[PDB]
Amino acid sequence: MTKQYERKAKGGNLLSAFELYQRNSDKAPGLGEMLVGEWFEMCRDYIQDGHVDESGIFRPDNAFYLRRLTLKDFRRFSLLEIKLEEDLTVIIGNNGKGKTSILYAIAKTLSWFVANILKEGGSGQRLSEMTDIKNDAEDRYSDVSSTFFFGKGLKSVPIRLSRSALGTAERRDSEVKPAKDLADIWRVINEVNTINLPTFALYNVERSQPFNRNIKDNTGRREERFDAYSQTLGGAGRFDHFVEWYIYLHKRTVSDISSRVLTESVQKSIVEKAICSVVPSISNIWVEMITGSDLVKVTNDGHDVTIDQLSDGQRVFLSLVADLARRMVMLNPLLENPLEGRGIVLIDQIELHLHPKWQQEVILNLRSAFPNIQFIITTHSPIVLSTIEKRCIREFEPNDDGDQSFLDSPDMQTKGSENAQILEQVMNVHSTPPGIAESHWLGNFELLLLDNSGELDNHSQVLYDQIKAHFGIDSIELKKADSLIRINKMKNKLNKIRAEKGK
Amino acid sequence: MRELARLERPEILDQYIAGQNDWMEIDQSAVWPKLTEMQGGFCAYCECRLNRCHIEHFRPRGKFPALTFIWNNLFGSCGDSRKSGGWSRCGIYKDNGAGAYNADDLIKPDEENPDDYLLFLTTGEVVPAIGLTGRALKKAQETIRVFNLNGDIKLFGSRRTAVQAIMPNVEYLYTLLEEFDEDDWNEMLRDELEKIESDEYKTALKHAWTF
Amino acid sequence: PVISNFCMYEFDNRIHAACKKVEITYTRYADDLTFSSNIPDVLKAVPSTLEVLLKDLFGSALRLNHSKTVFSSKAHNRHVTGITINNEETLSLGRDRKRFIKHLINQYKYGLLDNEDKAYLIGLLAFASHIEPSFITRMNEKYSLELMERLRGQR
RNA sequence: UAGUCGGGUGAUUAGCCAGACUCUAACUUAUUGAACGUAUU
Ligand SMILES: Nc1ncnc2c1ncn2[C@@H]1O[C@H](COP(=O)(O)OP(=O)(O)O)[C@@H](O)[C@H]1O
Ligand SMILES: [Zn+2]
Numbered sequence: 046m047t048k049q050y051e052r053k054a055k056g057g058n059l060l061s062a063f064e065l066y067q068r069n070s071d072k073a074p075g076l077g078e079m080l081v082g083e084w085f086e087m088c089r090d091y092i093q094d095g096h097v098d099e100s101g102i103f104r105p106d107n108a109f110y111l112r113r114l115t116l117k118d119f120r121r122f123s124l125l126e127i128k129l130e131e132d133l134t135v136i137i138g139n140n141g142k143g144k145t146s147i148l149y150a151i152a153k154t155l156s157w158f159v160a161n162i163l164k165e166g167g168s169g170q171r172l173s174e175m176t177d178i179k180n181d182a183e184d185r186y187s188d189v190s191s192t193f194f195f196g197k198g199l200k201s202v203p204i205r206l207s208r209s210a211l212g213t214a215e216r217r218d219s220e221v222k223p224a225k226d227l228a229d230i231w232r233v234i235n236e237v238n239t240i241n242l243p244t245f246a247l248y249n250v251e252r253s254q255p256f257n258r259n260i261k262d263n264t265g266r267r268e269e270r271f272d273a274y275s276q277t278l279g280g281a282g283r284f285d286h287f288v289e290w291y292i293y294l295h296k297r298t299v300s301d302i303s304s305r306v307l308t309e310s311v312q313k314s315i316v317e318k319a320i321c322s323v324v325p326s327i328s329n330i331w332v333e334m335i336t337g338s339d340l341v342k343v344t345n346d347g348h349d350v351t352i353d354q355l356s357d358g359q360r361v362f363l364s365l366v367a368d369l370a371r372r373m374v375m376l377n378p379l380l381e382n383p384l385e386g387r388g389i390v391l392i393d394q395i396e397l398h399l400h401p402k403w404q405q406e407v408i409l410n411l412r413s414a415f416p417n418i419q420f421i422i423t424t425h426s427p428i429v430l431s432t433i434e435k436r437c438i439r440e441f442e443p444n445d446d447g448d449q450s451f452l453d454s455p456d457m458q459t460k461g462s463e464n465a466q467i468l469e470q471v472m473n474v475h476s477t478p479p480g481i482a483e484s485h486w487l488g489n490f491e492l493l494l495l496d497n498s499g500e501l502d503n504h505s506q507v508l509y510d511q512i513k514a515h516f517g518i519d520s521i522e523l524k525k526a527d528s529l530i531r532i533n534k535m536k537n538k539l540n541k542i543r544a545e546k547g548k
Numbered sequence: 549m550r551e552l553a554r555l556e557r558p559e560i561l562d563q564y565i566a567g568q569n570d571w572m573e574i575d576q577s578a579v580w581p582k583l584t585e586m587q588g589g590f591c592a593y594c595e596c597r598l599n600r601c602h603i604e605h606f607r608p609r610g611k612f613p614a615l616t617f618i619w620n621n622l623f624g625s626c627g628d629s630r631k632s633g634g635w636s637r638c639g640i641y642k643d644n645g646a647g648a649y650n651a652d653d654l655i656k657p658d659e660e661n662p663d664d665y666l667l668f669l670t671t672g673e674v675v676p677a678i679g680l681t682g683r684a685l686k687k688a689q690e691t692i693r694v695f696n697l698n699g700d701i702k703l704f705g706s707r708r709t710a711v712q713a714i715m716p717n718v719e720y721l722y723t724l725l726e727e728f729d730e731d732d733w734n735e736m737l738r739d740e741l742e743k744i745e746s747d748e749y750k751t752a753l754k755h756a757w758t759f
Numbered sequence: 760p761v762i763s764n765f766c767m768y769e770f771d772n773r774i775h776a777a778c779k780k781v782e783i784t785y786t787r788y789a790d791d792l793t794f795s796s797n798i799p800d801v802l803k804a805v806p807s808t809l810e811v812l813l814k815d816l817f818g819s820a821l822r823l824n825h826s827k828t829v830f831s832s833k834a835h836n837r838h839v840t841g842i843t844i845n846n847e848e849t850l851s852l853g854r855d856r857k858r859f860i861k862h863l864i865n866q867y868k869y870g871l872l873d874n875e876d877k878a879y880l881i882g883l884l885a886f887a888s889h890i891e892p893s894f895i896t897r898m899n900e901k902y903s904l905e906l907m908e909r910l911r912g913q914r
Numbered sequence: 915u916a917g918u919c920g921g922g923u924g925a926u927u928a929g930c931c932a933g934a935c936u937c938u939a940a941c942u943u944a945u946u947g948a949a950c951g952u953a954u955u
Contacts, residue, residue, distance in 0.1 A: 535723065864926090
């Protein structure tokens with residue numbers, strides 16, 4: 046009844062406060078109001094409250110992130126459970142272990158939030174009945190359960206996506222009501238008074254397709270605020286949409302002369318700063334209107350070049366960063382720094398097309414540009430892991446058949462560690478290839494010097510000459526070989542001075 | 549491996565009788581103090597510091613139930629099945645991974661000497677000792693294969709970078725034989741040897757320093 | 760209620776028998792199975808046992824709610840069917856509900872509590888007296904015995 | 915460090931003070947029905 050809702054709402058419950066607001070609103074000239082001024086004000090303050098911490102970053106009072114994911118008979122997992130971190134989660138493993146499956150499930154879950162933010166009662170994406178159910182499952186259905194956190198007033202938002210296999214008489218339903226309720230809160234509060242909206246984005250392998258400026262009549266209006274949710278979880282961020290939006294911003298800025306200052310110029314400057322700060326090679330971006338087709342130009346290593354002359358790796362990362370910055374800017378109009386808005390971003394193979402030099406700073410740049418975004422990322426690289434804390438890593442055992450219950454962190458601290466150590470321990474990969482016969486030569490040497498008595502002979506000298514010819518003088522392998530030679534020549538002069546006196 | 553010396557059998561082991569009483573009944577907190585003095589908090593098969601550890605039966609209870617409550621068949625091994633199965637090394641690998649092995653083909657660190665059956669190269673790989681022929685070589689190879697001393701990259705890499713971490717120390721100490729007299733260099737060698745007792749891999753480092 | 764209690768008599772019997780041997784105590788409030796143990800790393804193997812036993816007994820008709828399987832320890836909030844278990848191994852209503860009751864009593868002290876909320880507080884204090892009797896004594900100390908006597912039962 | 919527990923103060927669901935805990939790990943729920951507490955009786 047009314048009084049239970051009032052007791053919960055005054056205690057901090059967001060759902061009860063929104064229920065009270067909607068009810069009291071219903072009576073337009075009756076009990077309640079328009080901003081119920083108690084209930085609508087509490088809901089909007091819940092969504093909008095925050096403070097700037099000591100580092101100058103705005104922090105929302107009630108953060109939004111994904112707490113837990115359960116996968117039941119989904120692809121290769123019989124029953125898997127994940128405990129994603131609030132700020133960054135990195136999933137690693139061999140090929141075909143299910144990282145892309147996890148990101149796909151999370152994106153399918155977030156599509157319901159996006160759809161119900163866009164429309165009342167909108168329908169999000171659903172699990173496939175042809176490929177998502179485990180092939181050898183007995184039940185012939187799959188579940189994807191999730192729990193979301195939106196502050197102390199809304200600690201759990203459970204949503205379950207289910208699908209029965211093709212040609213099964215008994216069908217399984219999806220429990221998507223709480224996500225609809227949270228998105229209804231967001232949308233209704235936004236209608237009455239503009240509020241900052243969360244950003245949900247998925248960047249699959251489906252990105253990195255060629256980019257030509259073929260998008261003129263693209264139907265949709267890129268300035269319209271809710272265009273930031275269009276194809277946002279498809280896998281390939283709409284970089285053509287970003288180009289149109291950027292050209293629109295440039296036109297509005299150059300055609301112009303509450304404080305007589307254009308907010309389009311501020312948005313353009315924020316996006317420019319984000320793009321220049323995150324992408325290493327790109328230094329400045331602008332729009333050229335002479336040569337009278339619109340063109341976007343960037344400064345690559347001091348050379349002004351066009352947007353379609355970028356390499357695969359400076360264009361894919363630029364597309365990701367530009368799309369994310371555009372969506373964050375459009376969805377956070379009330380923030381001083383729109384990139385400090387909240388949301389969930391999924392990046393599959395963050396090291397894609399990137400040199401090892403760029404892998405050393407991609408995570409740090411992404412987290413500095415977007416500090417309140419919950420990043421859930423997969424990677425195949427020890428270099429990216431060396432820049433990431435141990436608690437953020439979820440590893441797959443090298444001998445998993447899908448029947449593992451809970452994914453875990455490695456036992457070795459990866460942040461600040463050498464790449465060889467992370468490769469050997471975390472990634473379970475030999476630092477030196479085992480299939481190359483030249484890799485066992487140092488060990489095969491040692492034995493020869495020990496098979497004898499620490500002393501060089503014909504075959505050991507042949508092997509040492511082979512190591513000299515292959516690796517070279519300055520190579521470390523010859524340094525260790527000659528160190529072993531010198532040492533064993535030394536522990537034998539010692540042995541000599543000892544057995545002589547020991548008789 | 550390292551030689552292991554025994555002590556008095558714990559007084560709770562004989563209170564239980566094999567066959568009638570199952571192993572999951574016993575209290576491990578009491579059998580452990582006696583498996584820690586002998587091992588110094590290090591694995592009996594790979595000499596890794598025991599952060600995740602469990603009681604290991606050298607002869608499996610499934611094949612040989614008779615040796616279930618016998619202080620001589622008890623051991624301290626790394627890994628833990630109770631803390632999830634992420635261990636392809638040592639006792640867990642012997643019971644689950646390797647398979648098709650004979651217990652008489654594995655060296656027992658309790659009684660048999662591991663120094664004369666195994667050699668730890670400075671490259672991080674353990675090979676059967678030089679001159680081993682017949683049953684000794686077969687036992688060494690079987691032990692290396694079954695306990696996965698060479699195998700899972702975690703153990704091999706950690707042991708390798710542990711041995712090569714002190715290679716400058718070995719070079720620097722041994723390059724000053726002629727500079728120092730016999731007694732001072734001898735005492736320096738002992739000082740170096742007795743401070744690797746607390747180090748993780750007991751015998752890899754020992755093989756790298758000594759003679 | 761009794762039909763549902765009887766339909767899980769065999770499930771309760773088997774679960775209790777298999778669960779007391781590993782030193783885990785088991786209860787069920789007719790929809791909500793509770794397990795606890797002082798031995799670490801033994802509860803993680805229980806949900807699989809529950810699933811296989813449910814398949815053995817009820818087939819596919821009855822199943823666990825995998826989204827409602829919660830592990831907890833003294834590092835986190837611990838509550839069983841509405842009662843918070845303290846870190847002092849005692850039953851409690853939780854800090855938040857006990858501060859809510861304190862606020863209600865303070866409102867009644869100054870006559871800011873209407874009839875409906877007064878009845879709600881008398882009901883909640885009866886429930887609190889049932890669950891945590893020491894809270895009644897603490898409120899008697901804080902808000903005087905006379906005020907509590909005027910609010911609560913007099914005869 | 916978080917997070918959690920909650921003894922006190924507090925016109926009191928907030929703020930603060932003292933103390934304590936940490937299995938990879940709570941998310942507080944549902945009536946009129948059933949049982950429990952309480953009141954009439
Ligand atoms: N329906 C299914 N049943 C069983 N196995 C599946 C099913 N769908 C996918 N898989 C398996 O799951 C893996 C999918 O790979 P993926 O999730 O993309 O992993 P990664 O991120 O490591 O490349 C493959 O090994 C595939 O064989
Ligand atoms: Zn070991």
